[PDB]
Design an enzyme around this catalytic site. Sequence first.
Site, PDB file in Angstrom:
ATOM      1  N   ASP A 182      -3.554   9.234   7.148  1.00  0.00           N
ATOM      2  CA  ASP A 182      -4.811   8.586   7.513  1.00  0.00           C
ATOM      3  C   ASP A 182      -6.016   9.536   7.507  1.00  0.00           C
ATOM      4  OD1 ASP A 182      -3.547   6.206   7.864  1.00  0.00           O
ATOM      5  OD2 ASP A 182      -3.718   6.110  10.045  1.00  0.00           O
ATOM      6  N   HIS A 195       0.561   7.590   2.278  1.00  0.00           N
ATOM      7  CA  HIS A 195      -0.694   8.295   2.542  1.00  0.00           C
ATOM      8  C   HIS A 195      -0.661   8.873   3.970  1.00  0.00           C
ATOM      9  CE1 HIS A 195      -1.165   4.394   4.469  1.00  0.00           C
ATOM     10  NE2 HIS A 195      -2.089   4.959   5.257  1.00  0.00           N
ATOM     11  N   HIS A 224       2.911   7.622   5.842  1.00  0.00           N
ATOM     12  CA  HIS A 224       3.433   6.269   6.041  1.00  0.00           C
ATOM     13  C   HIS A 224       2.963   5.369   4.895  1.00  0.00           C
ATOM     14  CE1 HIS A 224      -0.465   6.618   8.070  1.00  0.00           C
ATOM     15  NE2 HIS A 224      -0.597   5.305   7.886  1.00  0.00           N
ATOM     16  N   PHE A 239       0.859  -1.201   0.000  1.00  0.00           N
ATOM     17  CA  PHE A 239       0.000   0.000   0.000  1.00  0.00           C
ATOM     18  C   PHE A 239       0.890   1.244   0.000  1.00  0.00           C
ATOM     19  CE2 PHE A 239      -3.261   2.956   1.913  1.00  0.00           C
ATOM     20  CZ  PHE A 239      -4.312   2.730   1.032  1.00  0.00           C
TER      21      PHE A 239
HETATM   22  C1  LIG Z   1      -4.068   0.899   9.024  1.00  0.00           C
HETATM   23  C2  LIG Z   1      -3.499  -0.440   8.513  1.00  0.00           C
HETATM   24  C3  LIG Z   1      -2.029  -0.289   8.122  1.00  0.00           C
HETATM   25  C4  LIG Z   1      -4.021  -1.081   7.199  1.00  0.00           C
HETATM   26  O1  LIG Z   1      -4.357   0.016   6.285  1.00  0.00           O
HETATM   27  C5  LIG Z   1      -5.578   0.552   6.191  1.00  0.00           C
HETATM   28  O2  LIG Z   1      -6.557   0.057   6.774  1.00  0.00           O
HETATM   29  C6  LIG Z   1      -5.719   1.639   5.120  1.00  0.00           C
HETATM   30  N1  LIG Z   1      -7.000   2.303   5.372  1.00  0.00           N
HETATM   31  C7  LIG Z   1      -7.949   2.476   4.445  1.00  0.00           C
HETATM   32  O3  LIG Z   1      -7.928   1.821   3.383  1.00  0.00           O
HETATM   33  C8  LIG Z   1      -9.215   3.151   4.964  1.00  0.00           C
HETATM   34  C9  LIG Z   1     -10.286   2.087   5.280  1.00  0.00           C
HETATM   35  C10 LIG Z   1     -11.535   2.805   5.853  1.00  0.00           C
HETATM   36  C11 LIG Z   1     -12.638   1.753   6.119  1.00  0.00           C
HETATM   37  N2  LIG Z   1     -13.243   1.102   4.908  1.00  0.00           N
HETATM   38  C12 LIG Z   1     -13.837   2.612   6.475  1.00  0.00           C
HETATM   39  O4  LIG Z   1     -15.097   2.872   5.819  1.00  0.00           O
HETATM   40  O5  LIG Z   1     -13.906   3.413   7.688  1.00  0.00           O
HETATM   41  C13 LIG Z   1      -4.518   2.458   5.439  1.00  0.00           C
HETATM   42  O6  LIG Z   1      -3.457   2.140   4.952  1.00  0.00           O
HETATM   43  S1  LIG Z   1      -4.754   3.738   6.668  1.00  0.00           S
HETATM   44  C14 LIG Z   1      -3.249  -2.159   6.415  1.00  0.00           C
HETATM   45  O7  LIG Z   1      -3.181  -2.036   5.163  1.00  0.00           O
HETATM   46  O8  LIG Z   1      -2.539  -2.943   7.083  1.00  0.00           O
HETATM   47 FE   LIG Z   2      -2.527   4.364   7.332  1.00  0.00          FE
END
Ligand SMILES: CC(C)[C@@H](OC(=O)[C@@H](NC(=O)CCC[C@H](N)C(=O)O)C(=O)S)C(=O)O
Ligand SMILES: [Fe+2]
Length: 329
Positions: A214, A212, A268, A209
């Site tokens: 948060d 970005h 990050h 990923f």
């Molecule tokens: C944080 C972790 C590292 C993880 O990354 C996440 O969950 C990625 N968040 C989003 O896609 C947002 C998702 C929002 C969710 N659908 C909503 O409706 O509230 C991020 O990288 S922050 C991972 O990849 O391990």
């Molecule tokens: Fe994140």
Amino acid sequence: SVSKANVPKIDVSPLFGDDQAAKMRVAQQIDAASRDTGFFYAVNHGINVQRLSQKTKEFHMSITPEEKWDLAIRAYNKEHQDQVRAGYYLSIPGKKAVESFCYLNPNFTPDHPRIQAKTPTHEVNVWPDETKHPGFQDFAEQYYWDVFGLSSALLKGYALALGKEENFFARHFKPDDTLASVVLIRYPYLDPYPEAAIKTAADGTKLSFEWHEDVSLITVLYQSNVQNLQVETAAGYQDIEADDTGYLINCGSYMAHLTNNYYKAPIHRVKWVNAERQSLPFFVNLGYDSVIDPFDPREPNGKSDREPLSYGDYLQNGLVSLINKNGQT
Ligand SMILES: CC(C)[C@@H](OC(=O)[C@@H](NC(=O)CCC[C@H](N)C(=O)O)C(=O)S)C(=O)O
Ligand SMILES: [Fe+2]
């Protein structure tokens, strides 16, 4: 190689009690970490994370392809137009490795006023069949309230750290209307790992990923003990050590907005690792109409030249923008 990021371990247990002096000493530690790399590990948090990981593993390894279509968000199943946030996010073998299940406030029931009004970002959770996944829904709903409780205590520490009264953020973080979400993410071990599911950073680092900030006030994360996160600092991208006993905490862009970047939302990214692991974030979101007037703790009068932004406006726009930038997860 890559240098290790400074990610202090902060004992947050005084934030659950009534020793005001002890709470100020915790707030100073939060202030220091927020002004440095932007990350810290909350320890002595009181949550049973081993049980969380066991229950999540039982779910991820037993759910079937049939159930995934039946719980899928609208990006994967056009029959489910009400499911934008909550539900199953499928993998695409040979192309996309990650898969996950997202759920929202359990109080968003069919009779909730925001569900009746069809207000954006509010949805009724979808769950697998109870006979196929015994105890899963009850465990997951109780986990929401356990991590809500830790997040409320952390928000008292951030408020004190910024020179405010301890309920400054927490008064807008309420069980009846929080927009907070839990995501149960599965990163698989694959042999051969499809190159199409691996991204490449400008510096050559293999990623799952991209970079970005948060979309949250704060992010409260449990992950397996497999190193993978990196944070951009003035000295470059640095590795965040894994710690499957603590919660990794960082600010989101709503905190940066409210503090006029005093507490930045750290940039990050997630490195590609060929390992079967879990990533279980809790995104601390306020209510749809929550508005906190922006301020600046570095200025004598505390005033900022930023305009007030409702949390609902921030969230709807932020989630769409993150999908456009880094792809549908
Ligand atoms: C944080 C972790 C590292 C993880 O990354 C996440 O969950 C990625 N968040 C989003 O896609 C947002 C998702 C929002 C969710 N659908 C909503 O409706 O509230 C991020 O990288 S922050 C991972 O990849 O391990
Ligand atoms: Fe994140």
